[PDB]
Amino acid sequence: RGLAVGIALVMYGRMEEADALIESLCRDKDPILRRSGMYTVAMAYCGSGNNKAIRRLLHVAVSDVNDDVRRAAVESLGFILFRTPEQCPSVVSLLSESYNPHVRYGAAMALGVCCAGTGNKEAINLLEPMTNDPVNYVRQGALIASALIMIQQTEITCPKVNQFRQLYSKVINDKHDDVMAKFGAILAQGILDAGGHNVTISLQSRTGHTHMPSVVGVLVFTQFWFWFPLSHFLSLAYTPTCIIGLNKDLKMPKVQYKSNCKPSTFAYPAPL
Amino acid sequence: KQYEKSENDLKALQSVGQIVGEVLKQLTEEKFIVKATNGPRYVVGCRRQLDKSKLKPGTRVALDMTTLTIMRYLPREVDPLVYNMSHEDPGNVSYSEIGGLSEQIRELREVIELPLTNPELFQRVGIIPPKGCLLYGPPGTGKTLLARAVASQLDCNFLKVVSSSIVDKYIGESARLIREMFNYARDHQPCIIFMDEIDAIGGRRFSEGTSADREIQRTLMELLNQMDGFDTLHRVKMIMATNRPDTLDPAL
Amino acid sequence: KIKENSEKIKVNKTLPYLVSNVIELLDVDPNDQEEDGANIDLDSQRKGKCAVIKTSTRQTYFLPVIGLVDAEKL
Amino acid sequence: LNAKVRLLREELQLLQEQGSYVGEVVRAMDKKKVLVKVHPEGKFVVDVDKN
Amino acid sequence: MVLESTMVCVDNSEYMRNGDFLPTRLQAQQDAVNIVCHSKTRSNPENNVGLITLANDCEVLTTLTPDTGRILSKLHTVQPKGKITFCTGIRVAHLALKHRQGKNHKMRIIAFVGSPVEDNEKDLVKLAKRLKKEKVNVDIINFGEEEVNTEKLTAFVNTLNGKDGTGSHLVTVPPGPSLADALISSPILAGEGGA
Amino acid sequence: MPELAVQKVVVHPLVLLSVVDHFNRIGKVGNQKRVVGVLLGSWQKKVLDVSNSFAVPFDEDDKDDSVWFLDHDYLENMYGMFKKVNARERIVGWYHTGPKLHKNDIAINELMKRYCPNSVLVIIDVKPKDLGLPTEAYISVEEVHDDGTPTSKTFEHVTSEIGAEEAEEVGVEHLLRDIKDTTVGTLSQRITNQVHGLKGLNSKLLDIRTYLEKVASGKLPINHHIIYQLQDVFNLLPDASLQEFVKAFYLKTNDQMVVVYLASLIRSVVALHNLINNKIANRDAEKK
Amino acid sequence: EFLHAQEEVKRIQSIPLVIGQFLEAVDQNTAIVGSTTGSNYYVRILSTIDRELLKPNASVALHKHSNALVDVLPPEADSSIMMLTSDQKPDVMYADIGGMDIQKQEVREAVELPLTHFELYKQIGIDPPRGVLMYGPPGCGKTMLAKAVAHHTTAAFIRVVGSEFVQKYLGEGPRMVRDVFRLAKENAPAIIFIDEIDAIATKRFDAQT
Amino acid sequence: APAVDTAEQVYISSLALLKMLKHGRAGVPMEVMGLMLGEFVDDYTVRVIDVFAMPQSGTGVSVEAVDPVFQAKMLDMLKQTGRPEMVVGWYHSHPGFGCWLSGVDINTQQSFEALSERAVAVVVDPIQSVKGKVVIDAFRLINANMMVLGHEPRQTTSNLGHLNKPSIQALIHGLNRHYYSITINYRKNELEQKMLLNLHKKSWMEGLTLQDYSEHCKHNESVVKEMLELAKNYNKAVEEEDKMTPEQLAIKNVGKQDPKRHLEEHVDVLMTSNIVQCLAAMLDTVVFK
């Protein structure tokens, strides 16, 4: 498991070399290696979309009824389509219908990553049936996906933000729900509130091009299905974003900045 | 030795309370249709090991309670009561104590005793030995002593059956015993079957009576078909004993 | 070892428990009853002494009878 | 077609049950239990599912 | 021996029916083969012996077991067809030796000779290199080439000696009345490095 | 010992699977060498259903015929052991690991008869190849030769088929990333079968053809069988002829169309209206 | 995948199975049955079964785990008794009760002519017979006429004894009637003969018991 | 109650799984068992390479069912193969019950646990199965208290888990007491996958084969004759079928036993059958001469 994720991590923004790795890991005897191969393409490609990477992934998944590959195709999309963030819900609308819980898991993870910084209305609704389905992994993945988009966004932006917290809470109090779901719920809560909504996980930086630590951090984090200390990697994805000034001597000025909006609403509205 | 006995007990408990059935009709080699002696009719399988050929509708099979697959073969169905009737053949009373009746005694032998040894004697005549014997007489004569007394001397298989308590109010349970004795005799050929006090089963028109007049008729119907209906006896002879031939059904 | 196997018997010996009547006593051997043919051989009649017992609740039950209970009475 | 199979996995666990019976309602009680008589088994006072 | 896998190769020839050993060679060799087996078992219970026949085409009679019984039963049978098919006996043995139920033991071949060995010097020398490389020794009990024949065998046995601590042995048994057991002359009952 | 008692041979998916595994398992002994195992299964059945196989150590030389090693011990211990679990399953025989039938095989077979109550030669062509089956069945027949010596041992082919129990078939589907291949089915499958047949026929003709070249020069024997087969092709002269067509297919779809339209008419009102509802539905869902 | 999914349902459809009898189809999703147990169930209908042959009365299978309607059985299968007294026929013909000419002509016309050939009787215009009642003095011998025709056809004669309908085993009795009658419908034509209805069905029933 | 244990993920090989199905079908209905051979790798993974059986007995799934004679005998022979394998655990089948262990069966699991605590009991169901995905579950089996406290999920970590129901509430309760469903993964690959794929090389002869012309005619005749019968209903079908309600349609225009479904089905068999027979006859002609 350790070695498998590690092959994906080293790539980033070197598209072409990864095309070689992924096919070989997929053919092998080991199920784990199949999932790691997707990660390999997702990272190398994250920088700009292409047709090549999505096309490669897509053929393997349709051809066969193999679970491990079928999740892989759908998952891989979000990272690469990042440039126009609408697109990931387009491909995933046909894929979320699939009865395979694998595909359904993979559809949710993908939506989570792409939309994280600049959201979409369509992405939100796709996640709802996964939560509902009774299988263990579909539910955990769906609840963590919901939170990712929602980070650095206050609980008065829309009512959904509020709803998401109540759901997380419901599950953790409960013993009537799945163990695997309790982990997704708590983690989910954790992401949404982190740094009191001054810490963020986005697809891109405010410069206008890719914010590398956030992208990287999410995928290494999503495994925990086997081995649980793995979840702590989420810390790299968490990046502080606050307007702070600079003084000539490198210390903190207590200057003022203008804001177009009332700053009173955003001071953590509606907590528990 | 004790451990061996203890071992069979576990077999029941693994199947959870094994139940008896019978093969109604064979659908295919795998699937039989089984009617249960316990209640519901069932669709059943067979063990790989247990052969299909062995099972018959004339005979009984056993089923695992929890999966309904035939574990094994069981023998032909016979009532508990009928086992006791066959045994009851020596009830004592020798041929000496029934004398003076001797002329009438000779008449009983022609019907009962002759077809056992040879049905061939009546066959040469070109006639099938006469069906059913009726013993009747005033009380104290020894109509029951006679039937009983010869059965012991020969010591042939003789079912001695009390039919004045065989009718019960338990619908369907009264039917089975009456059938079973005819079937059984055909198997244990030669045999004699004597029913004593079947005056009880001897019925009348009734139809303004209690529940007690109703049960008698079902049994009385069954006897008619079994004798002459489409079913009939052979070498084996059925003997009736009464007190009045007037208590009897007009059809009988 | 006798006691572990008998404990299951003891619970059935204790209350609640029914009365019934014996339809037939088969009493066949634990030793080979016939070598079954067909797909896989072996014996399927690996039953020891058996009895077909009729409960007074109008159902029929098949049961392997123990060897400790005297055979004669039965 | 996908819908038919999606439905299908759920049905197997749902179907697992202690059976069913058919009776008729003689009368209902005000408290929302109904006195019904099951035709082969005894009479029961038991509640309704309003789903 | 202690932790050795041994294949005894049995000679069954038209020179085994012979009466040079009194009363018969067959019997005298029969006492010899049993002794060799009883001795190894008494020596170590973990020691095993196997059976292959030198004569005719190759039959693997037994793979590794403790049984004296297998080797006894074969001996009673005679083979007029085949004598000493040495080159082949070594090859089946080497292969056979590898798979074991007393695993990671030393590799040994004992062959009984009791017929003139047909095989010339070119076969023999060739066989010695195969033996070195696999690191298996072959032991010869020689009453088969003093009976009307010169001993080809000695040079080969000498060269083979010292490839491990259970070296080769040339065990000398006379041809005339003296039995197939005179095992006293050189070790074979259990392994030794010397000749 | 029984080899003649088999007309037809059926193999479970298990045996085909099991053999490939055994090859490695022995400690990776191959190349020139082969690996054999026991076949456990039925006999006294005209149909031979081979139930299982378990690994056996083996070293083979197929370039020589005066050396082979066959583990004696495994066969015997395994036959003695198995009776308690299954009284029908006995050692059915042994599989050979390709590439084709050898005369090298009679020798190994002989031993197997002695040890084992039964033997059979199932030849599984090497390591996984092909879409169809790679097993052929052979029974050792004793024949007279009218030119050599009577009682020669040779191999005659018998029909090879497949067949397995219900539970096993269900297992194959779970593991596998499809269900089975072609032999005949759907409309598509029949046409594939035709193309599958041509590549297959072509292979058989190469065997004969390469042999003739070898018999003519290089002096491989002349057998009456080979020559008989070739001659017949020329003689029979098949002549193309009429028939086998039908036109019915169109009427059926036309009939169904009128009904299909009545259904679309009722459907239209709901389908048409729904389009607007969907776009709005996505906003509501996100809001609440 | 649909095939592998269908295989999920194939495993539940297996044994244990208990036979019920299909009263009617409310829908192609739920239906009403009355089982042979002696209890009725309103149960759910799964997937990969026909309701085309099962819509009117037929045998049906329930799974004993679910106690719901898993599978179907044909209307023909689970027939309580199919034939008897045609493979058990007497050898008695019309020439062993050589007299009673009026009687002989009536039985022959009612019983034999519809089994052998339904067309001819119907062809004339007059209906081929439906329900037969036979009445008279008992000393004539109704059973014997029944015998002669039982021999002559040698097929489509179902002999049922009126006591044989009633039963100790639970719920079999009203059901036992469904299984034999339903089979007569399938292997048309066939005659059902009840020996004596004069000692099983009575004018007075007391109904306290 | 506190203890520091890990769960065993059961990695079943393709070879091993198929044998477990084989044994379980055969045993029917009587419950049978056997031992599992494998290797212990990592810090929780027990892998099942292969399986063999302990005898078929009506005293099955018991300590008794286990035969010392089989176990020794195999192990000497296994040394020779160049695979003497560890006993990772034991498999059994219940075809009289589901995934709920029997009362004897819990004691039997315990004895295996003493030998190697990396021992599991895998339940194989082939006619008490509700799923064609192969209804198998794994238990290590630990006491009741561990479930009640909620300790048992602390021990399982490095598990996903799952829950299925072959047979009602009683099974669910039995499962929860044990250790519930611990994850089963499969060690499989394309070479093994290709072996299972196969059917017939005999497809070679069959694709080319076509039958006698008299037979071609039999088929064509039987179908046209059949089509006549259904045709009379078809007229009504096209004239009407305003109804869309399946139960009403069935009675009205003989919707159940539909002439459309069957007539189409019939044209399609006849067309395909004639094409393959005709196509082969012609192909063979050209090629052989």
Swiss-Prot record, chain A:
GO molecular function: enzyme regulator activity; ubiquitin protein ligase binding
One biological process term in Gene Ontology: proteasome-mediated ubiquitin-dependent protein catabolic process
Keywords of this entry: Acetylation, Phosphoprotein, Proteasome, Repeat
Top-level division of the source organism's lineage: Eukaryota
PC repeat spans: 2-35, 36-71, 72-104, 106-140, 141-181, 184-216
Positions of post-translational N6-acetyllysine modification: 175
Cellular compartments per GO CC: nucleus; proteasome accessory complex; proteasome complex; proteasome regulatory particle, base subcomplex; proteasome storage granule
UniProt family annotation: Belongs to the proteasome subunit S1 family.
Function text: Component of the 26S proteasome, a multiprotein complex involved in the ATP-dependent degradation of ubiquitinated proteins. This complex plays a key role in the maintenance of protein homeostasis by removing misfolded or damaged proteins, which could impair cellular functions, and by removing proteins whose functions are no longer required. Therefore, the proteasome participates in numerous cellular processes, including cell cycle progression, apoptosis, or DNA damage repair.
Quaternary organization: Component of the 19S proteasome regulatory particle complex. The 26S proteasome consists of a 20S core particle (CP) and two 19S regulatory subunits (RP). The regulatory particle is made of a lid composed of 9 subunits, a base containing 6 ATPases and few additional components including PSMD1. Interacts with ADRM1. Interacts with ZFAND1.
Protein name: 26S proteasome non-ATPase regulatory subunit 1
Originating species: Rattus norvegicus (Rat)
Gene name tied to this protein: Psmd1
Stretch of the intact protein here: 546 to 817 of 953
Curated annotation (Swiss-Prot), chain D:
Top-level taxon in the UniProt lineage: Eukaryota
Record's subcellular location: Cytoplasm; Nucleus
Family: Belongs to the AAA ATPase family.
The protein's role, per its UniProt record: Component of the 26S proteasome, a multiprotein complex involved in the ATP-dependent degradation of ubiquitinated proteins. This complex plays a key role in the maintenance of protein homeostasis by removing misfolded or damaged proteins, which could impair cellular functions, and by removing proteins whose functions are no longer required. Therefore, the proteasome participates in numerous cellular processes, including cell cycle progression, apoptosis, or DNA damage repair.
Oligomeric form and interacting partners: Component of the 19S proteasome regulatory particle complex. The 26S proteasome consists of a 20S core particle (CP) and two 19S regulatory subunits (RP). The regulatory particle is made of a lid composed of 9 subunits, a base containing 6 ATPases including PSMC5 and few additional components. Component of a complex with USP49 and RUVBL1. Interacts with PRPF19. Interacts with TRIM5. Interacts with NDC80. Interacts with PAAF1. Interacts, in vitro, with the thyroid hormone receptor (in a thyroid hormone T3-dependent manner) and with retinoid X receptor (RXR). Interacts with ERCC6.
The protein's name: 26S proteasome regulatory subunit 8
Species in which this protein is naturally found: Rattus norvegicus (Rat)
Shown residues in whole-protein numbering: 52 to 102 of 406
UniProtKB/Swiss-Prot annotation, chain G:
Keyword Nucleotide-binding belongs to the record: yes
UniProt protein name: 26S proteasome regulatory subunit 6B
Keywords assigned: Acetylation, ATP-binding, Cytoplasm, Nucleotide-binding, Nucleus, Phosphoprotein, Proteasome
Positions with a binding annotation for ATP: 136-143
Lineage, highest ranks first: Eukaryota, Metazoa, Chordata, Craniata, Vertebrata
GO BP: any one term: proteasome-mediated ubiquitin-dependent protein catabolic process
Assembly and oligomerization: Component of the 19S proteasome regulatory particle complex. The 26S proteasome consists of a 20S core particle (CP) and two 19S regulatory subunits (RP). The regulatory particle is made of a lid composed of 9 subunits, a base containing 6 ATPases including PSMC4 and few additional components. Interacts with NR1I3. Interacts with PAAF1. Interacts with TRIM5. Interacts with ZFAND1.
One Gene Ontology MF term: proteasome-activating activity
Location(s) in or outside the cell: Cytoplasm; Nucleus
Leader sequence residues: none
Purpose of the protein: Component of the 26S proteasome, a multiprotein complex involved in the ATP-dependent degradation of ubiquitinated proteins. This complex plays a key role in the maintenance of protein homeostasis by removing misfolded or damaged proteins, which could impair cellular functions, and by removing proteins whose functions are no longer required. Therefore, the proteasome participates in numerous cellular processes, including cell cycle progression, apoptosis, or DNA damage repair.
